[PDB]
């Protein structure tokens, strides 16, 4: 339960599932079938939680918003989404203050 190494950044990829806002219960829920929702859910609101935690502030520069994890906390299913242990600790403290990912080809 201690803070991990840079691998913490990679553990953010371990999270799996497609989260979407259902108008039936009126909440943001996670499913594994994108085909499950018809016209009751906006497809733009359906996003893989893997990339949902990444907030692009530039083109190729994304910042990890750990507050996104609180939305997963609403679901309360840690094993279902597969939240890494580095992610569990990241909710509290961090090695990298904000996990930043950027790729350039210049």
């Amino acid at each position: 339960m201690s803070i991990t190494s840079t691998d913490i950044c990679q553990a953010a990829d371990a999270l799996k599932g497609f989260v979407g806002f259902n108008r039936k219960t009126g909440r943001y829920i996670v499913r594994f079938s994108e085909d499950s929702f018809g016209m009751d859910v906006a497809d733009d609101s359906i996003t893989p939680t893997s990339e949902f935690v990444w907030s692009s502030v530039r083109d190729d520069v994304m910042r990890l918003g750990r507050e996104q994890l609180q939305i997963l906390l609403e679901q309360n299913i840690n094993e279902r989404l597969n939240i890494g242990e580095p992610l569990l600790v990241y909710l509290r403290r961090q090695d990298l203050p904000e996990i930043t990912a950027q790729r350039q080809l210049r």
Side-chain angles (χ1 to χ4, degrees):
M1 68 292 181
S2 305
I3 308 300
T4 54
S5 307
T6 308
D7 286 280
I8 184 174
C9 176
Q10 302 297 31
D13 179 87
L15 286 66
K16 55 172 174 172
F18 307 98
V19 60
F21 186 89
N22 80 94
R23 62 177 294 255
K24 184 174 299 188
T25 53
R27 57 193 54 158
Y28 210 30
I29 48 82
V30 182
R31 295 305 179 250
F32 296 98
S33 297
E34 303 179 286
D35 62 284
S36 58
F37 302 116
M39 67 180 183
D40 286 278
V41 178
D43 193 46
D44 290 271
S45 299
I46 302 179
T47 308
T49 185
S50 318
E51 197 183 280
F52 184 79
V53 295
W54 293 98
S55 304
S56 30
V57 294
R58 282 66 171 115
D59 283 81
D60 302 280
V61 189
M62 297 180 299
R63 293 169 60 200
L64 206 299
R66 66 179 188 155
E67 39 272 85
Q68 306 282 213
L69 282 67
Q70 301 184 212
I71 302 179
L72 309 181
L73 176 66
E74 303 294 287
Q75 298 301 271
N76 188 213
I77 33 86
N78 292 90
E79 301 185 272
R80 197 177 184 192
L81 284 168
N82 187 31
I83 290 87
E85 292 184 74
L87 278 274
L88 298 174
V89 301
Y90 191 43
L91 193 154
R92 321 185 313 190
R93 295 190 65 160
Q94 62 281 91
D95 184 276
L96 289 309
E98 294 173 28
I99 301 178
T100 33
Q102 66 183 272
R103 52 173 178 88
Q104 31 65 269
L105 191 58
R106 295 180 59 181

